[PDB]
Design an enzyme around this catalytic site. Structure first.
Site, mmCIF file in Angstrom:
data_model
loop_
_atom_site.group_PDB
_atom_site.id
_atom_site.type_symbol
_atom_site.label_atom_id
_atom_site.label_comp_id
_atom_site.label_asym_id
_atom_site.label_seq_id
_atom_site.Cartn_x
_atom_site.Cartn_y
_atom_site.Cartn_z
ATOM 1 C CG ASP A 35 3.011 -6.167 3.446
ATOM 2 O OD1 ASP A 35 2.939 -4.929 3.324
ATOM 3 O OD2 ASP A 35 3.217 -6.947 2.479
ATOM 4 C CB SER A 199 -0.438 13.137 0.738
ATOM 5 O OG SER A 199 0.268 14.209 1.316
#
Length: 330
Positions: A35, A199
């Site tokens: 994770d 992004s």
């Protein structure tokens, strides 16, 4: 040193991925959920409340000659999905794919929430976010990666998650045969303890690319792709019959649909998520309403590039003094 381990979807939907991890002496192999959005290595154990164990493999520290109680240490964690776990702490030898750390904090669960009990395939979590998020008190503990880092050939790990197939976590090296083209690296903020990056935009299907900054986290422990409501609405508007269902808890679409791809920007590079990756199947057995793999982050408070996005790429988690993230097509 290096390590290399195969990671395997827990079910036919790729709801999560499990990777075998050796703990203790002699080794006890547990299948953990790696994770990158948390920083605790915790396991089902011989100390876990019996009614809360249902098929998981447990760690028994009393059977490990290298286990030592970390005196006074406790831990307690709550995840973004509302699940939780807590317990005490041992140090022990932990190996992943041939890479061994001695003195790793292994957090033994005394209590786990229902969602963990109900998932027989996940024996615990291995956190790979920054150690500043580790919940051990009163002495915060380091992640497996943090402990291994100085010994690694290169201070990196890579996630290569498969679509409906196994993939690979590598530690200490970049497998140049595992991706196509070049790896594009992008800046990381560690201010919230996550692999947080921005992004450069998105496209839906064969549509034009929209240049826009989307701050979010690279999180192997989250199944889906969670993005701003504007972006998500633009995606689902291209699917006939798709709608946001408050009763179901997100966007659903007719199972008869063909889904468009979704592209996200990494610098000037582009990662394409095929439409099929966005299908999470019937909302309930036999339903013709299917659950979408792109969902709104509104009310999460952060955008999350979870498995839906990451499995479309070869992803480098570069833990150099100034960390960065790399993405390549594959």
């Amino acid at each position: 040193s290096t390590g290399s381990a195969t990671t395997t979807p827990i079910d036919s939907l790729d709801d999560a991925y499990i990777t075998p991890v050796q703990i203790g002496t002699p080794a006890q192999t547990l299948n953990l959920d790696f994770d990158t959005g948390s920083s605790d290595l915790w396991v089902f154990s011989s100390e876990t409340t019996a009614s809360e164990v249902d098929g998981q493999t447990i760690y028994t520290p009393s059977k490990s000659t290298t286990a030592k109680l970390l005196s006074g240490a406790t831990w307690s964690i709550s995840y973004g999905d509302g699940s939780s776990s807590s317990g005490d702490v041992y140090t022990d030898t932990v190996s992943v794919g041939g890479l061994t750390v001695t003195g790793q904090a292994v957090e033994s669960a005394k209590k786990v929430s229902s969602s963990f009990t109900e998932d027989s395939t996940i024996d615990g979590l291995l956190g790979l976010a920054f150690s500043t998020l580790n919940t051990v008190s009163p002495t915060q503990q380091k992640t497996f990666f943090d402990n291994a880092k100085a010994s690694l050939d290169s201070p990196v790990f890579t996630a290569d998650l498969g679509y409906h197939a196994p993939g690979t976590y590598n530690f200490g090296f970049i497998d140049t045969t595992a991706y196509t083209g070049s790896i594009t690296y992008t800046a990381v903020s560690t201010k919230q303890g996550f692999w947080e990056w921005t992004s450069t935009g998105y496209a839906v299907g064969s549509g034009t690319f929209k240049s826009t900054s989307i701050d979010g986290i690279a999180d192997t422990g989250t199944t889906l792709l969670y993005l701003p409501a504007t972006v998500v609405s633009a995606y689902w508007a291209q699917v006939s019959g798709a709608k946001s269902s408050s009763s179901v808890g997100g966007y659903v679409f007719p199972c008869s649909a063909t889904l468009p791809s979704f592209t996200f920007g990494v610098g000037s590079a582009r990662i394409v998520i095929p439409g099929d990756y966005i299908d999470f199947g019937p909302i309930s057995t036999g339903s013709s309403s299917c659950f979408g793999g792109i969902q709104s982050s509104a009310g999460i408070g952060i955008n999350i590039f979870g498995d839906v996005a990451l499995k479309a790429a070869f992803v480098v988690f570069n833990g150099a003094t100034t960390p960065t993230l790399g993405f390549a097509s594959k």
